[PDB]
Structure formats: structure tokens, C-alpha cells
């Protein structure tokens, strides 16, 4: 019934992918170790909690992308194969997949410009492989730009309440 392989083959690799958004569960404990609280995020006036979290909480938001970059490199050799299949049905899931792993990061105050990547496929028809690599090239290229944001915040990281940003 099986020869060391797996059902539906590991092609989709969607099984291990689900372990990504869940892998964070570990990155969360990191801060907790420093006696950090997930309740004093931002809003408790932060009058006495003047950044009481320390740099141990900010480094956590970054430790994630680092883990994702590792798993993301694995998908490269996965989609590259579908090149022969070119099955939009199977390729379509990939597009929604690479973007999904970015949805669980929102739990760590991480908000990439993914929402913007959605229009990318809307403008250009994504039903092939070759071109697909074009969509990813942006994901990895953009992610590496997010990490640099750790220069000194005052922007994407820790958004100011005054900055409504809605227009």
C-alpha cells in the first residue's frame, strides 16, 4: 500500500507547511521566558510599563522571519517541480499558501505588505509556473527588507496611535 512514501505524495507539502504558522508557538515562549506578559502589549497606558518588555520582545518578532526564510527555501524546490504539471489548480494553492504563512505572523505584531501582493495576481493572470517564480521573488525580496526595519523602528514597527494611516 506504501513504499516508505506518503499519501497524496509530499508534493503539495501543505502538510509540513501548516507546521510553519504553528511553529511560532515556540517563538512566543521566547519572550515569556524573560517574564514578559502578552497582555501588556500596547494600550495599558504603558505609563509604568515603559517598554518593560525590553529588547527581548522585539527580537522575537524577527526570530520568526528567520524561521520562515528556512521553510520558504524548501518550497522553492517544490514549486519548481510543478513546472511539468503546470496545473493551475495545484499552482493556485501555492499562491494562497506562501501568503497564508504570513497570516499567522500577525499574532506577533508582524504586518507585511502582503495585502498588497494580492493585487499582484489580480493584475497579472497567475496560472503557470515560470511566471509564478516572479511572484515569490517578491515575497523573499520583500521579507529581507522587513528585517532591516529593525534599524530604529519609528515607522513600520510599533505604529504610532496618532498615525491613523487610512487613505
* CATH number, position 120: 1.20.1420.40
**Contact by Cβ (8 Å): 53, 108:** no
**Max CA-CA distance within the chain?**
63
Helical (H) or strand (E) element with 114: helix 114-123
Any domain includes 166: no
**Using what technique was this structure determined?**
NMR
Number of Cβ atoms within 10 Å of the Cβ of 75: 19
**Contact by Cβ (8 Å): 149, 156:** yes
Number of Cβ atoms within 10 Å of the Cβ of 66: 10
Nearest-CA neighbor of 110 among 64, 49, 45, 76?
64
CA 71 to the chain's CA centroid: 10
Any domain includes 2: no
Any domain includes 132: yes
Any domain includes 5: no
**Contact by Cβ (8 Å): 56, 31:** yes
- Which 3 state secondary structure label does DSSP give 138? helix
Any domain includes 1: no
Query: How far is Cα 26 from Cα 79, in angstroms, rounded to an integer?
Result: 27
Q: How many domains does the chain have?
A: 1
**Contact by Cβ (8 Å): 123, 116:** no
Give the domain extent around 66: 12-157
Any domain includes 56: yes
Query: How far is Cα 110 from Cα 64, in angstroms, rounded to an integer?
Result: 9
Amino acid at each position: 500500500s506504501s513504499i516508505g512514501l506518503v499519501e497524496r505524495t509530499n508534493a503539495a507539502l501543505e502538510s509540513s507547511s501548516k507546521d510553519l504558522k504553528n511553529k511560532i508557538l515556540k517563538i512566543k515562549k521566547e519572550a515569556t521566558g524573560k517574564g514578559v506578559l502578552f497582555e501588556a502589549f500596547t494600550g495599558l497606558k504603558t505609563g509604568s510599563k515603559v517598554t518593560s518588555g525590553g529588547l527581548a520582545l522585539r527580537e522575537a518578532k524577527v526570530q520568526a522571519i528567520v524561521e520562515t526564510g528556512k521553510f520558504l527555501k524548501i518550497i522553492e524546490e517544490e514549486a519548481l517541480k510543478l513546472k511539468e504539471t503546470g496545473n493551475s489548480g495545484q499552482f493556485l494553492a501555492m499562491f494562497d499558501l506562501m501568503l497564508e504563512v504570513v497570516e499567522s505572523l500577525e499574532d506577533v505584531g508582524i504586518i507585511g505588505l502582503k495585502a498588497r501582493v494580492l493585487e499582484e495576481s489580480k493584475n497579472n493572470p497567475i496560472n503557470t509556473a515560470e511566471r509564478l517564480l516572479a511572484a515569490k521573488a517578491q515575497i523573499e525580496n520583500q521579507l529581507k527588507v522587513v528585517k532591516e526595519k529593525q534599524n530604529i523602528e519609528n515607522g513600520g514597527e510599533k505604529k504610532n496611535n496618532k498615525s491613523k494611516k487610512k487613505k
